[PDB]
Design an enzyme around this catalytic site. Structure first.
Site, PDB file in Angstrom:
ATOM      1  N   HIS A 130       0.845  -1.229   0.000  1.00  0.00           N
ATOM      2  CA  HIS A 130       0.000   0.000   0.000  1.00  0.00           C
ATOM      3  C   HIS A 130       0.871   1.266   0.000  1.00  0.00           C
ATOM      4  O   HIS A 130       0.289   2.341  -0.099  1.00  0.00           O
ATOM      5  CB  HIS A 130      -1.069   0.041   1.114  1.00  0.00           C
ATOM      6  CG  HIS A 130      -0.559   0.071   2.519  1.00  0.00           C
ATOM      7  ND1 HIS A 130      -0.474  -1.083   3.310  1.00  0.00           N
ATOM      8  CD2 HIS A 130      -0.142   1.096   3.284  1.00  0.00           C
ATOM      9  CE1 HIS A 130      -0.025  -0.747   4.500  1.00  0.00           C
ATOM     10  NE2 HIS A 130       0.208   0.587   4.499  1.00  0.00           N
ATOM     11  N   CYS A 184       3.650   1.309   9.709  1.00  0.00           N
ATOM     12  CA  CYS A 184       3.493   0.224   8.710  1.00  0.00           C
ATOM     13  C   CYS A 184       4.882  -0.169   8.196  1.00  0.00           C
ATOM     14  O   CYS A 184       5.698   0.729   8.021  1.00  0.00           O
ATOM     15  CB  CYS A 184       2.501   0.533   7.577  1.00  0.00           C
ATOM     16  SG  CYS A 184       2.272   2.282   7.116  1.00  0.00           S
ATOM     17  N   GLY A 198       2.515   5.739  10.417  1.00  0.00           N
ATOM     18  CA  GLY A 198       3.869   5.625   9.859  1.00  0.00           C
ATOM     19  C   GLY A 198       4.604   4.393  10.372  1.00  0.00           C
ATOM     20  O   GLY A 198       5.719   4.139   9.886  1.00  0.00           O
TER      21      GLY A 198
HETATM   22  C1  LIG Z   1       0.465   2.715   7.314  1.00  0.00           C
HETATM   23  O1  LIG Z   1       0.289   1.613   6.450  1.00  0.00           O
HETATM   24  C2  LIG Z   1       0.631   2.488   8.839  1.00  0.00           C
HETATM   25  O2  LIG Z   1       1.338   3.229   9.530  1.00  0.00           O
HETATM   26  N1  LIG Z   1      -0.254   1.634   9.360  1.00  0.00           N
HETATM   27  C3  LIG Z   1      -0.250   1.101  10.711  1.00  0.00           C
HETATM   28  C4  LIG Z   1      -0.898   1.915  11.801  1.00  0.00           C
HETATM   29  C5  LIG Z   1      -1.581   3.092  11.572  1.00  0.00           C
HETATM   30  C6  LIG Z   1      -2.129   3.779  12.637  1.00  0.00           C
HETATM   31  C7  LIG Z   1      -1.998   3.263  13.896  1.00  0.00           C
HETATM   32  C8  LIG Z   1      -1.306   2.078  14.049  1.00  0.00           C
HETATM   33  N2  LIG Z   1      -0.762   1.396  13.025  1.00  0.00           N
HETATM   34  C9  LIG Z   1       0.329   3.990   6.485  1.00  0.00           C
HETATM   35  C10 LIG Z   1       1.213   4.349   5.289  1.00  0.00           C
HETATM   36  C11 LIG Z   1       1.051   5.809   4.892  1.00  0.00           C
HETATM   37  C12 LIG Z   1       1.925   6.786   5.373  1.00  0.00           C
HETATM   38  C13 LIG Z   1       1.795   8.121   4.980  1.00  0.00           C
HETATM   39  C14 LIG Z   1       0.780   8.496   4.115  1.00  0.00           C
HETATM   40  C15 LIG Z   1      -0.103   7.543   3.643  1.00  0.00           C
HETATM   41  C16 LIG Z   1       0.021   6.208   4.043  1.00  0.00           C
HETATM   42  N3  LIG Z   1       0.399   5.073   7.452  1.00  0.00           N
HETATM   43  C17 LIG Z   1      -0.634   5.644   8.064  1.00  0.00           C
HETATM   44  O3  LIG Z   1      -0.431   6.320   9.068  1.00  0.00           O
HETATM   45  C18 LIG Z   1      -2.033   5.534   7.443  1.00  0.00           C
HETATM   46  C19 LIG Z   1      -2.902   4.456   8.127  1.00  0.00           C
HETATM   47  C20 LIG Z   1      -3.676   5.230   9.193  1.00  0.00           C
HETATM   48  C21 LIG Z   1      -3.691   6.653   8.688  1.00  0.00           C
HETATM   49  O4  LIG Z   1      -4.367   7.585   9.128  1.00  0.00           O
HETATM   50  N4  LIG Z   1      -2.836   6.743   7.646  1.00  0.00           N
HETATM   51  C22 LIG Z   1      -2.735   7.931   6.802  1.00  0.00           C
HETATM   52  C23 LIG Z   1      -2.192   9.154   7.510  1.00  0.00           C
HETATM   53  C24 LIG Z   1      -0.832   9.273   7.786  1.00  0.00           C
HETATM   54  C25 LIG Z   1      -0.333  10.400   8.432  1.00  0.00           C
HETATM   55  C26 LIG Z   1      -1.184  11.418   8.811  1.00  0.00           C
HETATM   56  C27 LIG Z   1      -2.532  11.315   8.539  1.00  0.00           C
HETATM   57  C28 LIG Z   1      -3.036  10.192   7.888  1.00  0.00           C
END
Ligand SMILES: *[C@@](O)(C(=O)NCc1ccccn1)[C@H](Cc1ccccc1)NC(=O)[C@H]1CCC(=O)N1Cc1ccccc1
Ligand SMILES: *[C@@](O)(C(=O)NCc1ccccn1)[C@H](Cc1ccccc1)NC(=O)[C@H]1CCC(=O)N1Cc1ccccc1
Lengths: 305, 305
Positions: free
Chosen positions: A41, A145, A143
């Site tokens: 993703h 992931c 972040g």
């Molecule tokens: C990601 O796959 C991840 O970190 N998932 C695991 C997780 C998320 C929340 C709590 C615990 N574990 C994605 C990848 C990503 C990074 C940056 C931009 C787009 C996608 N990271 C995320 O944080 C995703 C998933 C949840 C979320 O809100 N999100 C998008 C985001 C990122 C940063 C700020 C606002 C929204």
């Protein structure tokens, strides 16, 4: 003496963690030999996550769209392929700090250490169990992931988990390192039900042996019981059933403490029916199930890496 | 989301751990630049430990009585001096993996990660607190002496603890890296009294803020209270008194959750008097005091290294 939720030392895994950026999406990757592994993703925008078509999104992408950083070192992507829910980026440079490793799919009830990372940088290490409903009760933020779970056997790192998603109920879901989800989950932002969680009975028994080893013996009762009688009770309290395999695995602990498994079973039986009465075992006022029989042996016998 | 007893990544400390042998006593040492630090009782036999004269025992020893191994590699001791309860062994080779480091003496209530070692080899990592009576509730076996505790502050390792002994009551005692004991303890095998332990009130409040951040809000009550009123209650239940310093340290958590410190204090007041009544906070049926306000902020905001 004493008993802690102990994690594996993380050093061999720290030197494998990299930052992967595609467009505006940044997350964590695992660099072993000349391959970087990360959640697929990474090719999604936040918008795409509602109903992603991984095929059509991936075709629109070339090798140079992928930025890989190990520290300030730029790695060059010379190949990319999607294996289930994981992306494999072939890079120009083999990781000189690649440890001896293997990819394992663990079973529910097994424990592992998680190295929680943000932008390819380690933040913290903690020990987890894979729940029977195939979730983990982690500690993860935006972040995280691409963070991984691992076991160490001697000099060998066993990678068993890559972190993908937080479910709407605040528990965690991910894949093995071949990109197959644990449990019925998909990498899409849509309501997903985990099934009922159950207590990992064999682990609770391991922890009671640990208690006895550490001088906590008050729960030890006069009674015995049979598997069949023990299991009727366990199923009423949402405990996993105990098999002959579990009894065989507890043999060494049984032999060390001089307490037969079925005797320890009777003791647990009373605690389920009558509770702990505001007493504690190993400083906890609940029955703990995130130590395997192997974890107890490792900690109470002093096994190194 | 979620909340775990998270340890620091251990990699920078793993490359500093060595095996130190003198006669037939073997334990763990810390190799930083061209000095190896270890507990001074390495020069003792089991017999000597009952009533050791360290000056007299050290005079009988020369540089070549000391075997230092880093993995497969024998290091040559060209100098030895005793600084309080620590031995400093000058070796011919500076450790190539010496991180940026500092020696710090921590205060009671502060947390740190322990890298538990045996024969110079890392076995596991866990987080704990320095108790108010200057003991730690560790997980240590024979051969763990010389294991260290540390904090990581960006790229800098702060070493604060070297493990020396288990007291007859199963809790742990050691020194800072200048070899001064925490608490009234001596490196002698003799019954030694630890003070009454107390609950680290400021840490319990930090953990309640962590609960609120994670969606556990049932304990939040209508009421308020004053410091003076709160403290009369705390002293009855063996809680540390709360000072203006503690209130100042909780300010950022207060500001993030919109709950005034004294409000959170009233909520804690009720839990002491009425207990938790079956219910759990962040999966625990007891009030946790091994997270600092800084630990909570680190984990709930995602600080890396
Ligand atoms: C990601 O796959 C991840 O970190 N998932 C695991 C997780 C998320 C929340 C709590 C615990 N574990 C994605 C990848 C990503 C990074 C940056 C931009 C787009 C996608 N990271 C995320 O944080 C995703 C998933 C949840 C979320 O809100 N999100 C998008 C985001 C990122 C940063 C700020 C606002 C929204
Ligand atoms: C070392 O001081 C140590 O391990 N202390 C910390 C600790 C923590 C939990 C449980 C036990 N110990 C000493 C050093 C040592 C090692 C080998 C031979 C002599 C001295 N290690 C010990 O294990 C000490 C403390 C308990 C013990 O049995 N012991 C002395 C000993 C060991 C073996 C045979 C006789 C005497």
């Amino acid at each position: 003496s004493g008993f802690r939720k102990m994690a594996f030392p993380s050093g061999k895994v720290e030197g494998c963690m990299v930052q992967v950026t595609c467009g505006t999406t940044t997350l964590n990757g695992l660099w072993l030999d000349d391959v970087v592994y990360c959640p697929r993703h990474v090719i999604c925008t936040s918008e795409d996550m509602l109903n992603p078509n991984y095929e059509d999104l991936l075709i629109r992408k070339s090798n140079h769209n992928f930025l890989v950083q190990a520290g300030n070192v730029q790695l060059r992507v010379i190949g990319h392929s999607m294996q289930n829910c994981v992306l494999k980026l072939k890079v120009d440079t083999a990781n000189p700090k690649t440890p001896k490793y293997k990819f394992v799919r663990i079973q529910p009830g097994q424990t592992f250490s998680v190295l929680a990372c943000y932008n390819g940088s380690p933040s913290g290490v903690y020990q987890c169990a894979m729940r029977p409903n195939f979730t983990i009760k982690g500690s993860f933020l935006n972040g995280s992931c691409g963070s991984v779970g691992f076991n160490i056997d001697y000099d060998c790192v066993s990678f068993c988990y890559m972190h993908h998603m937080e479910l709407p109920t605040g528990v965690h879901a991910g894949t093995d390192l071949e990109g197959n989800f644990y449990g019925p989950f998909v990498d899409r932002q849509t309501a997903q039900a985990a099934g009922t969680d159950t207590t990992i009975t064999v682990n609770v028994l391991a922890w009671l042996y640990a208690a006895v080893i550490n001088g906590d013996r008050w729960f030890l009762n006069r009674f015995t019981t049979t598997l069949n009688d023990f299991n009727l009770v366990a199923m009423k309290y949402n405990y996993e059933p105990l098999t002959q395999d579990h009894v065989d695995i507890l043999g060494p602990l049984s032999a060390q403490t001089g307490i037969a498994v079925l005797d320890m079973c009777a003791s647990l039986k009373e605690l389920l029916q009558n509770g702990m009465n505001g007493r504690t075992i190993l400083g906890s006022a609940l029955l703990e199930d995130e130590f395997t029989p192997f974890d107890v042996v490792r900690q109470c016998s002093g096994v190194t890496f």
